RNA sequence: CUGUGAAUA
């Protein structure tokens, strides 16, 4: 209806419609996408003429959907006006439940130079608070997943400090921020500068690697350590350091913990032969507590509520490892599997009383 | 006796 559009335009009623659910649904459906349309131009001008009114509509539970529709149809001249408004209060808008959705769509829809100009407003702000915020963590992940890495180099510089990295990575929301950044930096962004990406990648990988023992044991940061272990190829130096300078010394203790046992499982699942052999050599020939009770680490892990899952992964690694083309490797994988199988047979009646022991017995009886 | 991770109508 055009009477409604002219009443919004002539009688200054845009705030009344945009802050009402059905009024704002009207504004989204009857906003013409064409930038040369006259109704489009006057409604856009009404939205952006007052900076404080524009920002209040971004933060409004219904008004933010209209601002999003204007972003979807925007051109360069409109985008420069929207960017200048959003830049005056960007950090607070990223914390807001409504306005952070406007920011996330603007990162997607603005021209890359304008979206970069927005994200550079975050450069000297409290980025720990933003990365662990329930709303702000999605803005950071959107920046990292959308813009080229040169638009957010300051984020990697911020996470280069070990205090910042540990605080963000050990958070329910901030571990998603760290993992998304690792995913983007370790992905082949072939249309961007290779060496710029790899320098940032190695700075963040070294940060995780320097703190790997604390992060692997943490409720949230253990996912990030698992991801670093799986990367390999040019990042294999970080996987090798994490296994050899942390996991090899701590394998038995980590396998008994709720979070770190997932890191041990991933290492057995994905590490190459040389590292798997060193991990098996720690299990069967390393430091064994109470050796008058325990023959090796299997005597602890077989009956443990988390360590039994490490044993199940060890079985699966050896079963697949017997197919190795190198008969020297497959001989070892078969001998580790026979050692596990003999220990399960010796303790079968105790193991049969538990769901863990039944799963281990069924996996071995499948062969 | 089975074991872990996100914000709008």
Whole-angstrom CA distances from A295 to A49, A289, A292 are 78, 9, 7
Cβ atoms within 10 Å of A34's Cβ, excluding its own: 11
Whole-angstrom CA distances from A189 to A5, A21, A158, A183, A194 are 45, 41, 21, 11, 7
Largest CA-CA distance found in chain A, in angstroms, rounded: 91
Query: Counting beta carbons within 10 angstroms of the beta carbon of residue A253, is it exposed (0 to 12), middle (13 to 18) or buried (19 or more)?
Result: middle
The answer to whether the beta carbons of residues A24 and A17 sit under 8 Å apart is yes
How many Å apart are A205 CA and B6 C1'?
23
How many Å apart are A269 CA and B6 C1'?
27
The answer to whether the beta carbons of residues A46 and A9 sit under 8 Å apart is yes
Cα of A140 vs its chain's centroid, Å: 11
**Domain extent listing, chain A:** 1-121
Token couple for A129:
């608070």
**What are the residues whose beta carbons fall under 8 Å from the beta carbon of A70, sequence distance 6 or more?**
A31, A44, A47, A78, A82
Token couple for A144:
């990292």
Rounded Cα distance between A4 and A70, Å, is: 18
Rounded Cα distance between A196 and A62, Å, is: 41
Residue A13 DSSP code: -
Rounded Cα distance between A240 and A274, Å, is: 10
Query: Counting beta carbons within 10 angstroms of the beta carbon of residue A254, is it exposed (0 to 12), middle (13 to 18) or buried (19 or more)?
Result: buried
Rounded Cα distance between A237 and A218, Å, is: 22
Token couple for A240:
């090798």
Q: Which residue is nearest to nucleotide B7 (CA to C1')?
A: A135
Nearest CA to A330 among A283, A288, A276? A276
CA dihedral A37, A40, A46, A49 (to 10 degrees): -70
Measured at the CA of A106, the angle between CA A105 and CA A112, to 5 degrees, comes to: 125
**What are the residues whose beta carbons fall under 8 Å from the beta carbon of A127, sequence distance 6 or more?**
A155, A158, A164
- Nucleotide with smallest C1' distance to residue A135 CA: B7
- Nucleotide with smallest C1' distance to residue A61 CA: B8
The answer to whether the beta carbons of residues A61 and A98 sit under 8 Å apart is yes
Cβ atoms within 10 Å of A360's Cβ, excluding its own: 25
Bases of strand B lying below 7 A from some protein CB:
1-9
In this structure, chain A runs to a length of: 367
Query: Counting beta carbons within 10 angstroms of the beta carbon of residue A87, is it exposed (0 to 12), middle (13 to 18) or buried (19 or more)?
Result: middle
Q: Which residue is nearest to nucleotide B4 (CA to C1')?
A: A259
Q: Strand, coil or helix: what is A164? A: helix
How many Å apart are A365 CA and B3 C1'?
23
Rounded Cα distance between A42 and A5, Å, is: 10
The answer to whether the beta carbons of residues A43 and A4 sit under 8 Å apart is no
Token couple for A141:
């992940």
Spell A111-148 as b/e; 16+ CB within 10 A means b: eeebbbbbbebbeeeebbebbbbebbbbbbbbbbebbb
Q: Which residue is nearest to nucleotide B3 (CA to C1')?
A: A306
Helix (H) or strand (E) holding A33: none
**What are the residues whose beta carbons fall under 8 Å from the beta carbon of A185, sequence distance 6 or more?**
A149, A156, A197, A200, A201, A204
What was the resolution (in A) of this experimentally determined structure? 2.2
How many Å apart are A222 CA and B7 C1'?
23
Query: Counting beta carbons within 10 angstroms of the beta carbon of residue A336, is it exposed (0 to 12), middle (13 to 18) or buried (19 or more)?
Result: buried
Phi and psi angles of residue A188, each rounded to the nearest 5 degrees, phi first: -70, 90
Token couple for A75:
């051109």
Q: Which residue is nearest to nucleotide B5 (CA to C1')?
A: A220
Q: Residue holding tokens 């079968």?
A: A348
Rounded Cα distance between A112 and A191, Å, is: 14
Whole-angstrom CA distances from A97 to A54, A135, A218, A246 are 16, 6, 28, 40
Query: Counting beta carbons within 10 angstroms of the beta carbon of residue A77, is it exposed (0 to 12), middle (13 to 18) or buried (19 or more)?
Result: exposed
Cα of A276 vs its chain's centroid, Å: 26
Q: What was the structure determination method?
A: X-ray
- Nucleotide with smallest C1' distance to residue A101 CA: B8
How many Å apart are A257 CA and B2 C1'?
14
């Amino acid at each position: 209806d055009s009477v409604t559009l002219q009443d919004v335009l002539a009688n200054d009623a845009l705030v009344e419609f945009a802050t009402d659910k059905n009024g704002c649904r009207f504004l989204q459906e009857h906003y013409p996408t064409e930038n040369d349309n006259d109704v489009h131009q006057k409604l856009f001008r009404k939205l952006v003429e007052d900076r404080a009114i524009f920002l209040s509509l971004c933060s409004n539970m219904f008004g933010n959907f209209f601002v999003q529709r204007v972003l979807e149809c925007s051109n360069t001249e409109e985008q420069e006006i929207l960017t200048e408004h959003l830049a005056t209060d960007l950090y607070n808008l990223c914390l807001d439940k409504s306005a952070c959705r406007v920011i996330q769509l603007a990162i997607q829809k603005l021209d890359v130079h304008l979206a970069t100009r927005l994200s550079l407003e975050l450069r000297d702000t409290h980025l720990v608070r933003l990365s662990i915020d329930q709303n702000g963590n999605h803005v950071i992940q959107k920046i990292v997943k959308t813009l080229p890495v040169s638009s957010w180099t300051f984020l990697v510089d911020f996470f280069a400090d070990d205090d910042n990295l540990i605080h963000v990575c050990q958070d329910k929301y901030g571990c998603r921020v760290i993992q998304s950044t690792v995913e983007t930096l370790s992905t082949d962004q072939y249309a961007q500068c290779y060496q710029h990406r790899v320098i940032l990648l190695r700075s963040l990988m070294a940060g995780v690697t320097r703190n790997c023992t604390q992060l692997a044991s943490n409720e949230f940061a253990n996912y990030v350590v698992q991801h670093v272990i799986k990367c390999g190829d040019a990042l294999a130096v970080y996987r090798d350091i994490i296994i050899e300078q942390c996991l090899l010394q701590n394998l038995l203790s980590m396998s008994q913990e709720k979070y770190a046992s997932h890191v041990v499982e991933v290492a057995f699942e994905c590490a190459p032969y040389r590292l798997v052999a060193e991990m098996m050599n720690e299990i069967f020939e390393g430091y064994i507590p109470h050796p008058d009770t325990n023959r090796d680490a299997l005597d602890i892990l077989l009956f443990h509520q988390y360590g039994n899952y490490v044993v199940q992964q060890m079985i699966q690694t050896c079963v697949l490892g017997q197919n190795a083309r190198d008969q020297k490797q497959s001989e070892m994988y078969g001998m580790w599997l026979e050692k596990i199988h003999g220990r399960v047979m010796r303790n079968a009646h105790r193991l049969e009383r538990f769901s863990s022991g039944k799963k281990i017995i069924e996996a071995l009886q499948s062969m």
